[PDB]
Design an enzyme around this catalytic site. Structure first.
Site, PDB file in Angstrom:
ATOM      1  N   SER C 367       0.870  -1.170   0.000  1.00 22.10           N
ATOM      2  CA  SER C 367       0.000   0.000   0.000  1.00 22.10           C
ATOM      3  C   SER C 367       0.910   1.224   0.000  1.00 22.10           C
ATOM      4  CB  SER C 367      -0.897  -0.009   1.247  1.00 22.10           C
ATOM      5  OG  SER C 367      -1.736   1.132   1.272  1.00 22.10           O
ATOM      6  N   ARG C 368       1.002   1.924  -1.131  1.00 22.55           N
ATOM      7  CA  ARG C 368       1.856   3.119  -1.203  1.00 22.55           C
ATOM      8  C   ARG C 368       1.375   4.208  -0.243  1.00 22.55           C
ATOM      9  NH1 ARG C 368       3.790   4.582  -7.354  1.00 22.55           N
ATOM     10  NH2 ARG C 368       5.139   2.743  -7.645  1.00 22.55           N
ATOM     11  N   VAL C 369       0.076   4.212   0.059  1.00 22.00           N
ATOM     12  CA  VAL C 369      -0.492   5.135   1.044  1.00 22.00           C
ATOM     13  C   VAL C 369       0.006   4.751   2.441  1.00 22.00           C
ATOM     14  CG1 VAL C 369      -2.626   5.970   2.121  1.00 22.00           C
ATOM     15  CG2 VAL C 369      -2.536   5.655  -0.345  1.00 22.00           C
TER      16      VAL C 369
END
Ligand SMILES: Nc1ncnc2c1ncn2[C@@H]1O[C@H](COP(=O)(O)OP(=O)(O)OP(=O)(O)O)[C@@H](O)[C@H]1O
Ligand SMILES: Nc1ncnc2c1ncn2[C@@H]1O[C@H](COP(=O)(O)OP(=O)(O)OP(=O)(O)O)[C@@H](O)[C@H]1O
Ligand SMILES: [Mg+2]
Ligand SMILES: [Mg+2]
Lengths: 48, 54, 505, 470, 170, 158, 85, 153
Positions: C367-369
Site C-alpha cells: 500500500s503506497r499510502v
C-alpha cells in the site's frame, strides 16, 4: 562438516549460475510466445 | 522439483523401510527382566528373520 | 473493399428520392447485424458514444462513427434486430439513477431494479462516462477504510480515496476479502459512515444471489448497492456496469459522504470490451486486446478519490479485483491495473491450503499510502509486526531444520510461528479496530510466546468474546480517542489480558 | 411451403443464403431442399443485401449454388417429455437409435432466455456421492453446478460414469445425458452400461428414467456447437413442466467452445487469444446460465471439462471455473502414481465447504487434510535433496500421515472393475469424516501405508493391515 | 468395405502430422483465414471425422470392423503441443515412444506409464489377461525402487529380489 | 525527495531550472507531488519566478496520444532554458516505460502491425527521436533523470 | 571505390542490430508478414548482400580489398538469437 | 524449415552448439543423429551392438549431468561414477581431427576405417582403458593413437 560446508557452498553458487541461464531462456520463450501469438491473431485479422 | 528422480526414489525407499519395519514387528509378535529382554532379543531376531525369506 | 451502404435496396432511396424521404440526420436503417453488432446507415448527426434506440425498444451505443455507417453495440438479444430496422436518436448519453434510494437494492448494469421488490424512487441521475476529479481539488489520503481483516488493516492498510487491487489466482479468496470488508462496515454504520457498492461483472446469477443472501442475513444490505451484469448479460452491459456503479458512488463522494466500490472483476470486464472491439474490427494487440484497454481501466479507477474540504470532503475508495492465471502478474490486463492502482493485495493458493487464511502474501502485497491510512493505535504496533514477520520469513528455512540453533534465532522462530497464527482469521468475522490492536499488541509484547502455537486461534477467539462481553467500554475508548498506545492504555490492556488469561487457564 | 431462399455461397460448414422477401432472424432454423436427407442451417448473422450467414448442422457436401432453402420461422425445435426417455436424439431432435420417430406431444426451442434473477434458489444442501475425496474436500450440492476438469486420459469420464452409477441409479428423478463431441464408442458403452443397470429399458421405454442426446466427434462443428443446448433443453422441461429433481450429465462441455472456434473464422470474427472466438465468455454464459436450479425445480449438473495440454489457464477451462458451485480437478501427476480417482486435493473446491453448511466437524477435518498435504508438498523439495533422515521426528511424522492420507483418498470404483480387477466401494459421508479425522489425529501412525491404498472406510484399512500380517 | 461386409481390417495413417500440414496448405491457398499455428480453425475435426470411421460393428450389422493406428510426430518430445493433443483427445489410447528409452536400450521404446489403452483387458484373450494383468504395475514399482537403490545403501533380500526380477522382465 | 533535491541543487550550483514530465501520472500522486514541492520550496505559489520547476502531466486517464506526447511537451519547455538562457537544465521523466506503452497503444490504434513483445514497430524511432533532443549543445545542456520500470523484471524486454 | 582501384578499405557497421530493427520497422509498416522476432523473411538477405561485398580481389582486378567489422549487440549473451545467428 | 527436412533423409548428422563449445569436433550429437541403415542385418551385429552400447552409456551420462551440475560427481553411486568415467572418455573419442581443419587446429587430419572404429569403441565400453586418462582420447584417430598419447604423458 568442513567438507559439507564447502560442498554446499559450491552447490549454492552452482544453483545461482543455473538460475541465471534458466531465467535467460525463460525470458526468450516468454517473449517468443507473445510475438508468435500476436502474429497469429494479426494474420487472421488481415485475411478479412 | 529438479531432482524429481531422487525425490521419488527417496520417498519410495523410506516408505519401504517403514512398511518393512512393521513386518518386523509382526515377526517379533509371532515370536513372543524378561518382558524387556524378549522385546530386545526378538527385535534383533525378527530383523534378521525379515532379511531372510528363503 | 465494398463498404456498407452500397447495397441494392439502400441505393434505390439515394437515387429515387421519395417525399420527405431523407431523415438521414436523426434516423437510420440497419445495413447489417450479428454478434451484438449492428451496422447502421444514416444517423448523420448521432454522436460518438450516443445511446440510440432500435425498433424493439432495445438500446445500443454508437462506438464507431464511420464514413457511410455507424457501428452500434447492442444492449440486448440481437435476434430482435434485422436488416432494415429503424434506429433513432434519443440524443442520449448513458445515464443512471443515483442516490440513497439505491441502498438495499439489486440493480442491472443500467440502474434498473432486478430484485422484483423496490421501485426506482431516485431523485438524481448521472452520466456513466465522466472525467475524474483533477489534480487540484483533492486531499492526500488520511482516513482509514477498515476491512476488518487484521493482516490487511495492519500490514497492507487502505485509506478512504485509495485504489487498492485485490489480485490472485482462481480459488484464492479475493471476493471473500471484499465481502468481509462490506460486512465490517456495519460496526461503524456517526463520523465513520461508509456506503458500499459491489459490482458483479460476468458472475453467475446464483453466485450473486448467495452473495446478497449473506449481506441480507448479516443486515449489511441496508447500506449496500449491488450492481449486477451477469455472464448471460450481453457484453456491452458488462462493459458499462463498473462505470454505472462508479457514478452511484460519486454521488456520495461529491455530497460530503464516503463510499466503497468493488469491481469483481476487471478481468471479465476487459474480456467484454475486447469482444466488442474485435467485432467492430478495431485493431487487435497483446492477447488480442485493443490499444485502448489500458485507457478503459485508467478512466474508471481515477474516478476514485479523496476530495477537498472546499468541495465537501467526501470520498470514494476502490477495490478492483483481478484474476491471475498461474500467478502471472506480468500478463497484460494485470500489468495495466497493477500500475494504475495505489497498491496491491496478492493472494496465494499455497498459503491458503496451508491454513494461512486470509491467504495474503505479506511479503509482496503493498500500500503506497501505507502508514498515512491507519489509526495511531495501529501505527504503534503494525510497523513492528511487519518487521518481525519479515525477519521470520527470511529464516523460515530453519523451521524445517534447526538443530544447533542459538537462543536468539530460536526466539525469532517461536514468535513468528505465533504471530503467523494470530494473522489467521475466519470468514465473515471482521474485527473492530480496537480488537485488532489488542490482539496484535499481545503478540508483539510476548504475552503469547509461552502458549502452544496450535491453540492461538482458540485463544484469540475466547479473548475477543471476553473483551466484547466485559470490556466494551475499553474497546469504545480506543476507537473514540483513536490514540496511540500510551502508558495508560498499556496498563489498561495488560489488566484485561492478565485477568482473561487466568480464567482461560 | 414457407418463404424461400437461395444458397449464394458454401465454404465448409458456413453457408450464405439469400432471401428476396422476408429475412429470417438470427437463430432461426432453415431447411435446405434437394438433398439425400434434410439439412438444417442455423442463422448466425445478417450480412446485408438480404443475405444471411448460417452454420450447418450436418455435412454440406452436395450443396449447389441456387438451391432453395426454407425458413421454418423459428429456432431448432426438439422433442421434450416422457417420449424422450430411453431414446437417443441428435442435435436437431431426430432419433438416432433406429427405433422410429419420437412422437412427442410438445417440442421446444433449443435457444432460450436464462432464468430471471428473482427466480434463483439460494438453498444449499449436500449431495453425497460416496466418493471420499469429493464428499470430504469439495462436496457437491443438490441442484448445484459441478465441473470435472481433466487433461487427456486422467479419468474425468470414468468419474462421470461412476457418479451416474452412484447418484442416478440409486435415486432416479429423471436423468439427461448429453454426449458432446466425444467418442461414439463411448456412447455405445454408456448405452449398454445403462441397459445392464436397467436405468434404460428397451421394452418399456416408459420405465426408462434417462434421455440420451448425442453429437460426437463424427459430427461437423455446427452440430457439436448446439448438441449441448439440445440436451439442456430436454432437462429444462423436466425441471419446469414437472418440477421433480433432474440430473444433467455432459461429456464434454469443452467441445461446445471448441466447435464454436472451428467456424468462428469463417463467420468473419477476429480471433482472440490462443485462436479462440472473441465471444467465448458470452457464448458460454448464455448456455451455462440456463443450467441452474430455480424456485420452480432443481437441475443437478455434472459436466466433464477437457483441459488442453494439461493447462488449466487455457481460455476454455479457465472461463468455466466461474460457472461452478463445485470444481473437481484431476491431475496427471496424481494419476501417474496409481492414485484413482486422480483428484487434486489442493486444487478442488466447493462453495458449500463452509462450517455453517456442513458443520465444523466436516469443515475442520477437510481443512486439516489439506494442511498436512500442503505441508508435505512444501517438504518434498527438502527430502528430494537430503532424503528423509535429515527430518525431525515431527517433520517426518507429517510425511508419513500425509502419504497415508493421500492413499486413503484413493478408492476402488465400481465402474472401474474392468481395470482394477476389484469390487467397487461406496463410503458414506459420516464414515469418511470419521476415518480421515482419526488419521489426522494420529490414531493410525502404526499402520502401514499400503493398508490405506485402494480401500473404502477406515475399517478396511485396519482389516487390510490384518490381512497383510499373514 | 471390409467393416461392412462381415470382415475385419486394420488401417495405418502414417502420418497425420503431414496430412494436417497439407490441409493447412490447401486451406491457406484457398484464402481461408488461418487459425492457431496457421492451421484451419477445424484441424481437430479433420482427424476426429476420419478416426471414428474406425469401429466395431454390431452382429445385427454383420459384426465386422475397422481398426486404426494413426501416427503423430512430435517435435523434441512435446506430446503437449496442439496437433498431438488434438489426436490424443480422439483416440482410444496412445503408444508413446521416447528417444531417452530408445537410446538406453528399451526397444521398442514404449513408455509404459504414459501409454494407455482405454479398452483394457477387454481387448486381450483370457490367456493374455491371465499373465499380463499385473505386469504394468510391477514394472512401475520396479522403476521406482531401481532409482532408490542407486543410493548404494544396504538392501534387504526382498528389495534385491524385486530389483533382480524387474531387470530381467525389462 | 531525491528528485526535489536534484532540482534544488542544480539551481544552486548551475543556475539551471528543472522540468518534471509525469508520463501516466496517477492523479492522487500528482496532487501529492505538487504539495510536496510547495512544502519543500522548489515551488513557490506567490513568486512564480522563484519557482525552480515546471510540471507537465499526462494523467493515466487521458487517451494514449496525450500520454505519448507529454514527454515532448516537457522536453520543449526545457529546451527553452538551454537555448534561450544558456542554462544547464534538468528534465525528469517519470516513467519512461509508460512513454513506450502509450506509443504502443497509439501504434495499435492506427492499425500498424505490432512488433516484438507487442510494442510499436517504431519503438526505436519513438524513443530515439525524443531522447536525442536531450544533450549538451554549444549553448547549454539538458540532463535527464528517468524513472524506469522493467517488465517482468526482464532486462532483455524490448 | 578503394576496393576496385587497387587500394584497401576497412568498414565498420556500428551496429547491424539497429539496422535490422530499422528495416523491421519499414517492413512492418509495409505490412509484410512478420516471422522470428517479427523480422521479415528477408532480414538475412539484408545483411548477406552487404557483407558479401567485403572481399579480397586478385591481381587481375588490382589486388585491392574491403574488410568489414560488423557489430552485433546480444542480450544477456544470447548468441543464438535470430540476427546474431 | 529443418523440421520438414528430416522427413526427406536416410541419415541425419545433427551438430550441437553445446558440444562444439566443449571443444569436441565434429560437434555431432550422438543421441540426436540417426540412420535408416543402422540395422544388424545391414551393418552386422558387432557394429550394431557397439553403437547401441555407446549411446546407452552416453544417455545414462546425460541423465546424470543435471544432478552433477549442483551437487557434483561425489553424489553418484559407485556404479554411476564408472559410467560417467567411460562416457566422458567416449565423448572425447568421438572427437577427431580433420584434414580440412588443419588450417585452424594445427593437428594432422585422420581417417579411421569402420572396422577399426567398432573395435576401438568396444574395448572402451568393455573397460579395457579405464586406466587411461581422459585427455588421451581427445582429438585422435584410432585407439592406438589414444594409447600413444597416453604415453606422451
Ligand atoms: N478468509 C477465509 N476464510 C475461510 N474461507 C475462505 C476465506 N476466503 C475465502 N474462503 C472460501 O474460499 C472459497 C473461494 O473464495 P472466493 O470465492 O472469495 O475467491 P474467488 O477468487 O472469488 O474465487 P472464484 O473466482 O473462483 O469465485 C469460498 O468458498 C470461500 O468461502
Ligand atoms: N478409478 C479408476 N480406476 C482404474 N483406472 C482408471 C480410473 N479412472 C481412470 N482410469 C484409467 O484412465 C484411463 C483413461 O480414462 P478416461 O478415458 O476416463 O480419461 P478421460 O480424461 O475421461 O479421457 P477423455 O476425456 O479423453 O475421454 C483409462 O484407461 C482407465 O483405465
Ligand atoms: Mg469470485
Ligand atoms: Mg471422454
Amino acid at each position: 562438516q568442513g567438507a559439507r560446508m564447502t560442498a554446499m557452498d559450491n552447490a549454492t553458487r552452482n544453483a545461482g549460475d543455473m538460475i541465471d541461464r534458466l531465467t535467460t531462456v525463460y525470458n526468450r520463450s516468454r517473449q517468443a510466445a507473445i510475438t508468435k501469438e500476436l502474429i497469429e491473431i494479426i494474420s487472421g485479422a488481415e485475411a478479412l | 522439483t529438479t531432482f524429481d528422480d531422487r525425490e521419488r526414489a527417496h520417498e519410495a525407499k523410506f516408505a519401504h523401510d517403514a512398511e518393512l519395519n512393521f513386518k518386523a514387528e509382526a515377526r517379533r509378535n509371532r515370536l513372543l527382566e524378561t518382558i524387556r529382554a524378549k522385546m530386545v532379543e526378538l527385535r534383533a531376531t525378527a530383523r534378521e528373520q525379515i532379511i531372510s525369506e528363503i | 473493399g465494398i463498404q456498407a451502404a452500397e447495397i441494392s435496396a439502400i441505393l434505390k432511396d439515394q437515387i429515387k428520392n421519395f417525399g420527405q424521404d431523407a431523415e438521414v440526420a436523426e434516423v437510420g436503417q440497419v445495413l447489417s447485424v450479428g454478434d451484438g453488432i449492428a451496422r447502421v446507415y444514416g444517423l448523420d448527426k448521432v454522436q460518438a458514444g450516443e445511446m440510440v434506440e432500435f425498433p424493439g425498444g432495445i438500446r445500443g451505443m454508437v462506438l464507431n462513427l464511420e464514413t457511410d455507417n455507424v457501428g452500434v453495440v447492442i444492449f440486448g438479444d440481437d435476434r430482435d434486430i434485422k436488416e432494415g430496422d429503424t434506429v433513432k436518436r434519443t440524443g442520449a448519453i448513458v445515464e443512471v439513477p443515483a442516490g440513497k434510494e439505491l441502498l438495499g437494492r439489486v440493480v442491472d448494469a443500467l440502474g434498473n431494479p432486478i430484485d422484483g421488490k423496490g421501485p426506482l424512487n431516485a431523485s438524481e441521475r448521472r452520466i456513466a462516462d465522466v472525467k475524474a476529479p483533477g489534480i487540484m481539488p483533492r486531499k492526500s489520503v488520511h482516513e482509514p477504510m477498515a476491512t476488518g481483516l487484521k493482516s490487511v488493516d495492519a500490514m497492507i492498510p487502505v485509506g478512504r480515496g485509495q485504489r487498492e487491487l485485490i489480485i490472485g489466482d482462481r480459488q484464492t479468496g479475493k471476493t471473500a476479502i471484499a465481502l468481509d470488508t462490506i460486512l465490517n462496515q456495519a460496526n461503524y454504520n456517526g463520523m465513520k459512515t461508509l456506503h458500499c457498492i459491489y459490482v458483479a461483472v460476468g458472475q453467475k446469477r446464483s453466485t450473486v444471489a448467495q452473495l446478497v443472501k449473506k449481506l441480507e442475513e448479516t443486515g449489511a444490505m441496508a447500506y449496500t448497492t449491488v450492481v449486477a451484469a451477469t455472464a448471460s448479460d450481453p457484453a456491452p452491459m458488462q462493459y458499462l456496469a463498473p462505470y454505472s456503479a462508479t457514478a452511484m458512488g460519486e454521488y456520495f463522494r461529491d455530497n460530503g459522504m464516503d463510499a466503497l466500490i468493488i469491481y469483481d472483476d476487471l478481468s471479465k470486464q476487459a474480456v467484454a470490451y475486447r469482444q466488442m472491439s474485435l467485432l467492430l474490427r478495431r485493431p487487435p494487440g497483446r492477447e488480442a486486446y485493443p490499444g485502448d484497454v489500458f485507457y478503459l481501466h485508467s478512466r474508471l479507477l481515477e474516478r476514485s478519490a479523496k476530495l477537498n474540504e472546499a468541495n465537501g470532503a467526501g470520498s470514494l475508495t476502490a477495490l478492483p479485483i483481478i484474476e491471475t492465471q498461474a500467478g502471472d502478474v506480468s500478463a497484460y490486463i494485470p500489468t495495466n491495473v497493477i500500475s494504475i492502482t495505489d497498491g496491491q493485495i496478492f493472494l496465494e493458493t499455497e498459503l491458503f491450503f496451508q491454513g494461512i487464511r486470509p491467504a495474503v502474501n505479506t511479503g509482496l502485497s503493498v500500500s503506497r499510502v501505507g502508514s498515512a491510512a491507519q489509526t495511531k493505535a495501529m501505527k504503534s504496533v503494525a510497523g513492528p509486526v511487519k518487521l518481525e514477520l519479515a525477519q521470520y520469513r527470511e529464516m523460515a528455512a530453519f523451521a524445517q531444520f534447526g538443530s544447533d540453533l542459538d537462543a536468539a534465532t530460536q526466539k525469532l522462530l517461536n514468535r513468528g510461528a505465533r504471530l503467523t497464527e494470530l494473522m489467521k482469521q475466519p470468514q465473515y468475522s471482521p474485527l473492530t479496530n480496537a480488537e485488532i490492536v489488542i490482539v496484535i499488541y499481545a503478540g508483539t509484547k510476548g504475552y503469547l510466546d509461552g502458549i502452544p502455537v496450535r491453540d492461538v486461534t482458540k485463544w484469540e477467539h475466547g479473548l475477543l468474546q471476553y473483551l466484547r462481553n466485559q470490556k466494551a467500554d475499553l474497546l469504545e475508548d480506543m476507537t473514540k480517542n483513536d490514540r496511540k498506545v500510551a502508558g495508560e492504555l498499556e496498563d489498561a490492556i495488560k489488566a484485561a489480558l492478565d485477568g482473561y488469561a487466568k480464567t482461560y487457564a | 411451403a414457407e418463404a424461400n431462399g437461395k444458397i449464394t455461397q458454401v465454404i465448409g460448414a458456413v453457408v450464405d443464403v439469400q432471401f428476396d422477401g422476408q429475412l429470417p432472424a438470427i437463430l432461426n432454423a432453415l431447411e435446405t431442399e434437394n438433398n439425400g436427407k434434410r439439412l438444417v442451417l442455423e442463422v448466425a448473422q445478417h450480412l446485408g443485401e438480404n443475405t444471411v450467414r448460417t452454420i450447418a448442422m450436418d455435412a454440406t457436401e452436395g450443396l449447389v449454388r441456387g438451391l432453395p432453402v426454407k425458413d421454418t420461422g423459428g429456432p431448432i425445435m426438439v422433442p421434450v417429455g416422457d417420449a424422450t426417455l430411453g431414446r437417443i436424439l441428435n442435435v436437431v431432435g431426430e432419433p438416432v437409435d433406429e427405433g422410429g420417430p419420437v412422437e412427442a406431444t410438445q417440442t421446444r426451442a433449443i435457444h432460450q432466455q436464462a432464468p430471471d434473477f428473482a427466480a434463483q434458489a439460494t438453498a444449499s444442501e449436500i449431495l453425497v456421492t460416496g466418493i471420499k475425496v469429493i464428499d470430504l474436500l469439495a462436496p457437491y450440492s443438490k441442484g448445484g453446478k459441478i465441473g470435472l476438469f481433466g487433461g487427456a486420459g486422467v479419468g474425468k469420464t470414468v468419474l462421470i460414469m461412476e457418479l451416474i452409477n452412484n447418484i442416478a441409479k440409486v435415486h432416479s428423478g429423471y436423468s439427461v445425458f448429453a454426449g458432446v463431441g466425444e467418442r461414439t464408442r463411448e456412447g455405445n458403452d454408456l448405452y449398454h452400461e445403462m441397459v445392464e443397470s436397467g436405468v434404460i429399458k428397451p421394452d418399456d421405454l416408459s420405465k426408462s428414467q434417462v434421455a440420451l442426446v448425442y453429437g460426437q466427434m463424427n459430427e461437423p462443428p455446427g452440430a457439436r456447437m448446439r448438441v449441448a443446448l439440445t440436451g439442456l433443453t430436454v432437462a429444462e422441461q423436466f425441471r419446469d413442466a414437472t418440477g421433480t429433481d433432474v440430473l444433467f450429465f455432459v461429456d464434454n462441455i469443452f467441445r461446445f467452445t471448441q466447435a464454436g472456434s472451428e467456424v468462428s473464422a469463417l463467420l468473419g470474427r477476429i480471433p482472440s487469444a490462443v485462436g479462440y472466438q472473441p465471444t467465448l465468455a458470452t457464448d458460454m454464459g448464455a448456455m451455462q446460465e440456463r443450467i441452474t436450479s430455480t424456485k420452480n425445480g432443481s437441475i443437478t449438473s455434472i459436466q466433464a471439462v477437457y483441459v488442453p495440454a494439461d493447462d488449466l489457464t487455457d481460455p476454455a477451462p479457465a472461463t468455466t471455473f466461474a460457472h461452478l458451485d463445485a470444481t473437481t480437478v484431476l491431475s496427471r501427476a496424481i494419476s501417474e502414481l496409481g492414485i484413482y480417482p486422480a483428484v487434486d486435493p489442493l486444487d478442488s473446491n466447493s462453495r458449500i465447504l463452509d462450517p455453517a453448511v456442513v458443520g465444523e466437524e466436516h469443515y475442520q477435518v477437510a481443512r486439516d487434510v489439506q494442511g498436512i498435504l500442503q505441508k508435505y508438498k512444501s517438504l518434498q523439495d527438502i527430502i528430494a535433496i537430503l532424503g528423509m533422515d535429515e527430518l525431525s521426528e515431527e517433520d517426518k511424522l507429517t510425511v508419513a500421515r500425509a502419504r497415508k492420507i493421500q492413499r486413503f483418498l484413493s478408492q476402488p470404483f465400481d465402474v472401474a472393475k474392468v481395470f482394477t480387477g476389484s469390487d467397487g466401494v461406496q463410503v458414506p459421508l459420516e464414515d469418511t469424516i470419521k476415518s480421515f479425522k482419526a488419521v489426522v489425529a494420529g490414531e493410525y501412525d502404526h499402520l502401514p501405508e499400503a493398508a490405506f491404498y485402494m480401500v473404502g472406510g477406515i475399517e478396511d484399512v485396519k482389516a487390510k493391515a490384518q490381512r497383510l500380517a499373514a
